[PDB]
Amino acid sequence: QDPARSVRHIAIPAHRGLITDRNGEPLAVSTPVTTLWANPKELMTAKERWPQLAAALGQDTKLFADRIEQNAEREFIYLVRGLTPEQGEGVIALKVPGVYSIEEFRRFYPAGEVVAHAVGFTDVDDRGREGIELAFDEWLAGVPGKRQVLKDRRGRVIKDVQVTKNAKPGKTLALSIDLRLQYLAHRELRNALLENGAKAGSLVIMDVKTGEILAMTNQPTYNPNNRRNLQPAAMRNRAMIDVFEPGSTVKPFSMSAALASGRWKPSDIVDVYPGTLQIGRYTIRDVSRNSRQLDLTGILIKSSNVGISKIAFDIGAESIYSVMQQVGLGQDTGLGFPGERVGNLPNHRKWPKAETATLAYGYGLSVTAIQLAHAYAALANDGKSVPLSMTRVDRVPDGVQVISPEVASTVQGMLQQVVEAQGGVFRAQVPGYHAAGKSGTARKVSNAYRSLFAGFAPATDPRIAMVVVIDEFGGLVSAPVFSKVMAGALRLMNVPP
């Protein structure tokens, strides 16, 4: 026969670490719940109690009985996971032979759908499945404790002996996210999509000094506290996953290369008439074909593919490739979100004219909204790249001077004119401030199109970079979202006009 006595162990679940926004507002909080397990060999001696027990578990009387009878020979099954402590005390109070309790934890997300994708959620075992919860699982999970029990020959717990290992609570995490900006971003992105008959999009706000992600919102979203009817479209962290050719939004990086080459100055003129350029069997065609001479700022205002291609042929694709690589386009973000997409910044030894031109006007690479906001942050931060962070930054990293301060300042002033000049993206203007940026028609890589707006403010002393992505010309839907969210974000951060 089996031993009359055996010393056994039971795990002591650990309290998962608090997630807060950068101002300490809670975003994910461990809620005590009660798990009930049974020894069927003991339960089998108390059948008349089963229907009361089943009703207190919210289980069907016969399905409950069938489950215990089917497991009669086992000494452990779970009865139910994650009752309220009040509910568990009610079941324990029934004193049914063979019913035992374990203290577990369930997450609650106080801000719900507003920050669903960035924070993520946990599975039935309280482990990270999505977002920060996944990326920082090890940090947040802590370490289960251990205690000894004495069991008899039939698996009855006859003594709680001792705790041999204290549970180690998980560690607290303060995100870079500012929930005030996050609520503004979520509201305005949602409202823009509903008003324009669009289904999906994303918005990223970054601190250009610190590399902090201040807001990251995607539509559709979901309530992480009630996933009962959750659609896969809604769980997608689009800002980090959706890859697209960024089109005209990377022409500022092409212009940065041109101004670093020694061959170009802002007052330089390019003739783009008649809005096309034959390069062998290929024709580069401009979206607006009403121009002859354009200065470098006008090439950005008109988004002339011919203009930027002629510059690119003069300076060589390798100069443009290098800037785009150094500002992080097509590169690992280092954020350690499993499944984050890197996109592709193709390289060549010999760049033919076609591939040189498509790189320079943004169809020769694929990026995410995070990478595009990161690149805009570098340009805004007087050309100094700072690592991306989803966590609060107290000591700002040195970062890397990727674009000379002078060139970055000149390109800031060109992008100010894109927003402010006659013929510019006037819907991206931010009353009280100089804003700077560039619209684009992005092409999805998996043709599906996205309306992009990328920019920063204040134009003459930048603090915040922003990318707006609307899945669906001239930012007519993404530019006004930038305008409204930047207007708000700057004042919530007490940025002076």
CATH of the domain at 241: 3.40.710.10
Dmax over Cα atoms in the chain, in whole Å?
A: 97
- The Cα 254–Cα 375 span in angstroms is 12
Query: Is 228 domain-assigned?
Result: no
Sign of the Cα pseudo-torsion (151, 157, 159, 164, in order): positive
Strands 157-165 and 436-445, bridge-based pairing: unpaired
> Which tokens sit at 55?
């009703």
Q: Rounded distance, CA 255 to CA 411, Å?
A: 7
For residue 229, tell me if it sits in a domain. Answer: no
Rg (CA), the chain: 29
Q: Which domain holds residue 455?
A: 177-223+419-497
Domain assignment of residue 473, yes or no:
yes
Say how many domains are in the chain.
Answer: 3
Same domain, residue pair 53 and 162 = yes
Residues 214 and 306 in one domain: no
239 vs 337: CA distance, rounded Å: 12
Tell me the resolution in Å. Answer: 1.4
Residue 231: inside a domain: no
The residue among 403, 418, 433 that closes a domain is 418
Asked whether residue 139 falls in the same domain as residue 215, the answer is: no
Residue 484 forms part of a structural domain: yes
- Cβ atoms of 277 and 314 closer than 8 Å: no
Kindly list the catalytic residues.
248
Residues 9 and 146 in one domain: yes
Out of 399, 418, 437, pick the residue that ends a domain.
418
Sign (positive or negative) of CA dihedral 83, 88, 90, 96: positive
Say which residue the tokens 């802590």 belong to: 142
Residue whose pair of structure tokens reads 């001077």 in the numeric block: 401
CA–CA separation, 384 and 168 (whole Å): 40
Phi, psi of 242 (to 5 degrees): -70, 125
End-to-end CA distance of the chain: 84
Question: 362 lies in a domain?
Answer: yes
Closest CA to 375 of 440, 285, 291: 440
Could you tell me if 202 and 336 lie in one domain? no
Q: Rounded CA gap, 26 and 377, in Å?
A: 27
SS (H, E, C) the chain: CCCCEEEEEEEECCCCCCEECCCCCEEEEEEEEEEEEECHHHHCCCHHHHHHHHHHHCCCHHHHHHHHHHCCCCCCEEEEEEECHHHHHHHHHCCCCCEEEEEEEEEECCCHHHHHHHHCEECCCCCEEEHHHHHCHHHHHCECEEEEEEEECCCCEEEEEEEEECCECCCCEEECCCHHHHHHHHHHHHHHHHHCCCCCEEEEEEECCCCEEEEEEEECCCCCCCCCCCCHHHHCCHHHHCEEECHHHHHHHHHHHHHHCCCCCCCCEEECCCCEEEECCEEEECCCCCCCEEEHHHHHHHCCHHHHHHHHHHHCHHHHHHHHHHCCCCCCCCCCCCCCCCCECCCCCCCCHHHHHHHHCCCCCEECHHHHHHHHHHHHCCCEECCCECECCCCCCCCEECCCHHHHHHHHHHHHHHHHCCCCCHHHCCCCCCCEEEEEEEEEECCCEEEEEEEEECCCCCCEEEEEEEECCCCCCHHHHHHHHHHHHHHHCCCCC
**Does residue 172 sit in the same domain as residue 187?**
no
Residue 232 lies in a domain: no
Nearest-CA neighbor of 287 among 320, 321, 247, 329?
A: 247
Q: Output the six-digit token pair for 127.
A: 């482990």
The pairing of strands 201-207 and 269-271 is: unpaired
In a domain, 268, yes or no: yes
Can you tell me the distance from the alpha carbon of 415 to that of 425, in angstroms, rounded to the nearest whole number?
Answer: 10
Residues near 80 by beta carbon (within 8 Å), at least 6 away in sequence: 35, 36, 57, 58, 59
Judging by beta carbons within 10 Å of its beta carbon (0-12, 13-18, 19+), is residue 24 exposed, middle or buried? exposed
Domain end marker among 176, 191, 211: 176
Both 429 and 315 in a single domain? Answer: no
Q: Are 192 and 217 in contact (CB under 8 A)?
A: no
Q: Which amino acid appears at position 165 of this protein?
A: K
